[PDB]
Amino acid sequence: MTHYDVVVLGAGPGGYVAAIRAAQLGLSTAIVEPKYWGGVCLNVGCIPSKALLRNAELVHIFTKDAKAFGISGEVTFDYGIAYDRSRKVAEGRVAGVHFLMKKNKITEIHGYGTFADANTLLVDLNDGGTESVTFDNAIIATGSSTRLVPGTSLSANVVTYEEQILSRELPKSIIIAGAGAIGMEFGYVLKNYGVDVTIVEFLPRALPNEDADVSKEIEKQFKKLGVTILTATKVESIADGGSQVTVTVTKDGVAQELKAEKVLQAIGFAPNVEGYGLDKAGVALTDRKAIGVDDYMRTNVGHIYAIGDVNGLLQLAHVAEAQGVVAAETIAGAETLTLGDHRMLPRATFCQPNVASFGLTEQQARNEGYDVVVAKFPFTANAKAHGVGDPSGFVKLVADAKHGELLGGHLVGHDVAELLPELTLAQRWDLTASELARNVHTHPTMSEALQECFHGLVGHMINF
């Protein structure tokens, strides 16, 4: 039936952006989405959570630091309003997507898509109808879905980020499976609102993907916040009894029964790869059930690309958009530039203090065989940190002794997730610590912490 130069499956951060880039390159484009315009990110992930995170932060300040700031008076916080605001922000962002589609003359198709042929797509319109769509190129951005603990299932008390982020009421207590960004974030929010929070992690450290120093620090903050985190603990089963939930866990042989009114499943996310004829299109998967892809987001099938979480490279919004652009451009044959080693891409957990990082960890760089060089500067020695009321955290940078090329960056502190830009730019365009050390940073700011690390990397730090 209808035909288009390019058709994207999914309107998440990766899908709607790849669609825009395709449109900007003069390519007839259409996007197929049945539910979430803006994907999980805008509707029930990035956007809404960051809103709640901010609310939780203020509850923290006007509580634990009220006296330190000369604040008096009895004050209370209604999570309901927090919830409502988060939904409003999301709602506004979603509206933006539809605007962008209209502005770029991108055709929207409201329904579920299924590959019938290598260049045909059968769509189940949300109105009940059904239309066939031919395409010379296709971009799969179907995202991913939360992976539950083997043997367990979702119920009224055992939920995923989705059902939890849409709850206007909070439980008296909760048990979170997974100490990843998403798990830590909910822990921060919930705890700040009076919910007893226990976080269980199979690996030996919270935020295991991060550098060991970062994990150790963020664990200090959470324990200080009142959150109970259990590492090297394995979740055996989750039994929802109605009045409460019993999660059996094991650690070094000993097994105990943890009970809470609710349990959030967040151990990981597995790409959505089944149910829409990926096999009929010819697209192959990986040993990890992820869509195989090359440096150009291209799949085993030439005209079919896979971007976003569906390829499991780095399940993060900005990555999905980045791959989307690389997908569209390469399709149009226009100038593009592969992202390269996806480990060099930035990431951040938005609890307070923030956790931001990129590249390899100290240990990682070592095992890799590089001539590792490390510099670490505490925020207790930063003026801005003291002025804002959060002197915690630090900036740890990793480079190679040869010419001083950055290998990675690991930060923890007040909104440090904004300090990554300079680092990645330098690593991507080969700017050594020597050049970084000659860049003047405004005073007084958190960024100065980076400047000192640049100095400690090259020669000696000044204000330390």
Ligand X SMILES: Cc1cc2nc3c(=O)[nH]c(=O)nc-3n(C[C@H](O)[C@H](O)[C@H](O)COP(=O)(O)OP(=O)(O)OC[C@H]3O[C@@H](n4cnc5c(N)ncnc54)[C@H](O)[C@@H]3O)c2cc1C
Annotated binding site: 33-41, 50, 113, 178-182, 201, 266-269, 309, 317
Q: Cα–chain-centroid distance for residue 122? A: 31
**214 lies in the binding site for its own copies (CB under 8 A):** no
SS3 256: strand
Answer for which of 316, 365, 385, 457 binds ligand X (CB under 6 A) is 316
Please report whether residue 313 would count as binding ligand X according to CB under 6 A: no
Nearer CB in complex with ligand X: 91/405: 91
How far is residue 99 CA from its own chain's centroid?
25
Q: Does 35 bind ligand X (CB under 6 A)?
A: yes
Q: Does 34 bind ligand X (CB under 6 A)?
A: yes
Q: Does 161 sit near ligand X (CB under 6 A)?
A: yes
Question: 215 contacts which partner out of ligand X, its own copies, none, CB within 5 to 8 A by kind?
Answer: none
Backbone angles phi, psi at 182, to 5 degrees: -55, -40
Shortest Cβ distance from residue 307 to its own copies (Å)?
13
Asked if 431 is part of the footprint of its own copies (rule: CB under 8 A), the reply reads yes
To the query of whether residue 443 is one of the catalytic residues in this protein, the response is: yes
Question: With b meaning 16 or more CB within 10 Å and e meaning fewer, what string describes 73-109?
Answer: eeeebebeebbeebbebbeebbeebeebbeeeebbbb
Return the axis-axis angle of helices 181-192 and 46-64, rounded to nearest 10°: 40
Asked if residue 243 binds its own copies (CB under 8 A), the reply is no
Residues 6 or more apart whose Cβ sits within 8 Å of residue 267: 147, 148, 149, 177, 178, 180, 202, 235
The residue assigned the tokens 């987001």 is 297
Nearer to its own copies, 37 or 112 (CB): 37
Q: How far apart are the first and last CA of the chain?
A: 69
Q: Identify what 309 binds: its own copies, ligand X, none; CB under 5 to 8 Å per kind.
A: ligand X
**3-state SS class at 130:** coil
Using CB under 6 A as the binding rule, the residues of this chain from 205 to 234 that contact ligand X are none
Known binding-site residues for NAD(+) equal: 178-182, 201, 266-269
Does 100 participate in binding its own copies (rule CB under 8 A)?
yes
Q: Counting contacts by CB under 8 A, is residue 333 touching its own copies?
A: no
Q: How many residues bind ligand X (CB under 6 A)?
A: 40
Per CB under 6 A, the list member of 200, 320, 399, 458 interacting with ligand X is 320
Q: Facing residues of 3 across strands?
A: 134
Phi and psi at 203, nearest 5°, equal -70, 165
User: In whole angstroms, what is the distance from residue 55 CA to residue 57 CA?
Assistant: 5
Is residue 11 close enough to count as binding ligand X by CB under 6 A? yes
- The stretch near ligand X (CB under 6 A) out of 44-52, 69-77, 247-255, 408-416 is 44-52
- Choose, by CB under 8 A, the member of 318, 343, 366, 376 that binds its own copies: 318
Residue with tokens 């990082």: 357
Asked if 308 is part of the footprint of ligand X (rule: CB under 6 A), the reply reads: yes
- Pick from 317, 411, 412, 420 the residue near ligand X by CB under 6 A: 317
Contacts of 346 (CB under 8 A, 6+ apart): 318, 356, 357, 358, 420, 423, 424
Interacting residues with its own copies between 352 and 391 (CB under 8 A): 356, 381, 383-384, 386-389
Find which of its own copies, ligand X, none residue 32 binds, CB within 5 to 8 Å per kind: ligand X
Nearer to its own copies, 70 or 128 (CB): 70
Residue 238 in contact with residue 247, Cβ under 8 Å? yes
Asked if 456 is part of the footprint of ligand X (rule: CB under 6 A), the reply reads: no
- Mark the segment that binds its own copies (CB under 8 A) among 75-83, 222-230, 236-244, 275-283: 75-83
Contacts of 302 (CB under 8 A, 6+ apart): none
Per-residue x/- track, 32-61, its own copies (CB under 8 A): ---------xx---xx--xx-xxx--x--x
Upper half-sphere CA count for residue 370 (Cβ side, 13 Å): 22
- Residue 446: contacted member of its own copies, ligand X, none (CB under 5 to 8 Å, by partner type): its own copies
Catalytic residue among 98, 342, 443, 455: 443
Rg (CA), the chain: 23
Q: How far is CA 140 from CA 105, 262, 277, 283, 327, in A?
A: 20, 35, 12, 10, 10
Among 198, 315, 382, 432, binds ligand X (CB under 6 A): 315
Measured from the CB atom, the residue of 66 and 116 that comes closer to ligand X is 116
Which candidate, 10, 6, 3, places its Cα nearest to that of 311? 10
Cα separation values, 123 from 128, 134, 176, 197, 244, Å: 10, 11, 37, 43, 42
Is 22 a binding residue for its own copies by CB under 8 A? The answer is no
The pairing of strands 111-117 and 173-177 is unpaired
Binding partner of residue 147 among ligand X, its own copies, none, CB under 5 to 8 Å per kind? Answer: none
**Which among 26-34, 72-80, 273-281, 401-409 is the span making contact with its own copies, rule CB under 8 A?**
72-80
- Catalytic residues, which ones? 443
Q: Which residues bind ligand X (CB under 6 A)?
A: 9-15, 32-36, 39-41, 45-46, 49-50, 112-113, 141-144, 161, 165, 182, 272, 276, 308-310, 315-318, 320, 350, 443
